[PDB]
Design a protein around this ligand. Structure first.
Ligand SMILES: Nc1nc2c(ncn2[C@@H]2O[C@H](COP(=O)(O)OP(=O)(O)OP(=O)(O)O)[C@@H](O)[C@H]2O)c(=O)[nH]1
Length: 252
């Protein structure tokens, strides 16, 4: 067909099989989730969007899935990120120093995937799904991430870390999942400090991006929630990752 209904990419190929396999694999590796029934997880995931209009998804839709994917996360080792998820994941992979959303069962199930159904048919739409700007923000994928991110942020305590992409326009972007949901759902009773690591992209020698206006905005927002803010530059992420693997080392 030469023109699609929505402006976004459509459901990821073999979505149901992909999601089921991820659930099997996650529940094999992580013993606290050893017991989860993956068919049921898939059935609750499907329940959230199938047969529903994909511009009319609500956080309620995902509550069955949220219950099934209930999980403890070490609250003081949370790493949040904005537009730099590969480095976040490479870092937590070394020795599990922190945990991102994609280290939880639900974040691992959905990472990199797209999905949406059709009102009053039970088909998955593999041709297009709503684009958040053009069509609607209340679509299956957006609503999932807003729902699961808010719960993850509510679970954090003590010092929470966030990696931000210092190669971008808006280092802190108030429209991102981190800026629109997670910053506002950290609980000040529990969270002492949000520490941002601003990841440089920029050829070696660079500015102190902790002075960027958007980082000052983030400091202001966080400080006014009664949480302390700290920021550090990571000037050379490749050197950082190496120091994480081999800290005894080479000019770390
Ligand atoms: N793994 C993961 N994906 C997320 C998270 N929050 C949003 N996403 C998804 O990541 C993908 C890319 O989002 P972005 O790079 O921020 O680009 P964008 O925000 O969609 O820009 P627009 O298309 O104009 O809305 C989309 O599927 C998002 O829904 C999250 O916390 N973790």
């Amino acid at each position: 067909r030469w023109r699609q209904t929505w402006s976004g990419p459509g459901t990821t190929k073999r979505f149901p099989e992909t999601v089921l396999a991820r659930c099997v694999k996650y529940t094999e590796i992580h013993p606290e989730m050893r017991h989860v029934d993956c068919q049921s997880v898939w059935d609750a995931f499907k329940g959230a969007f199938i047969s529903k209009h994909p511009c009319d998804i609500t956080e309620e839709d995902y509550q069955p899935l949220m219950k099934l994917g209930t999980q403890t996360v070490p609250c003081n080792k949370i790493l949040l990120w904005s537009r730099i998820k590969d480095l976040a994941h490479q870092f937590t992979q070394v020795q599990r120093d922190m945990f991102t959303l994609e280290d939880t069962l639900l974040g691992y199930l959905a990472d990199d995937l797209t999905w949406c159904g059709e009102f009053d048919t039970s088909k998955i739409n593999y041709q297009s799904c709503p684009d958040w700007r053009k069509d609607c923000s209340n679509n299956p994928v957006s609503v999932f991430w807003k729902t699961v991110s808010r719960r993850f942020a509510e679970a954090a305590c003590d010092v929470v870390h966030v990696m931000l992409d210092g190669s971008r326009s808006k280092i802190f972007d108030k429209d991102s999942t981190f800026g629109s949901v997670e910053v506002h759902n950290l609980q000040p009773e529990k969270v002492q400090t949000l520490e941002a690591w601003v990841i440089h992209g920029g050829r070696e020698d660079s500015r102190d991006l902790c002075q960027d206006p958007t980082i000052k905005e983030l400091e202001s927002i966080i400080s006014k929630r009664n949480i302390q803010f700290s920021c550090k530059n990571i000037y050379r992420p490749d050197k950082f990752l190496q120091c994480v693997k081999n800290p005894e080392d080479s000019s770390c």
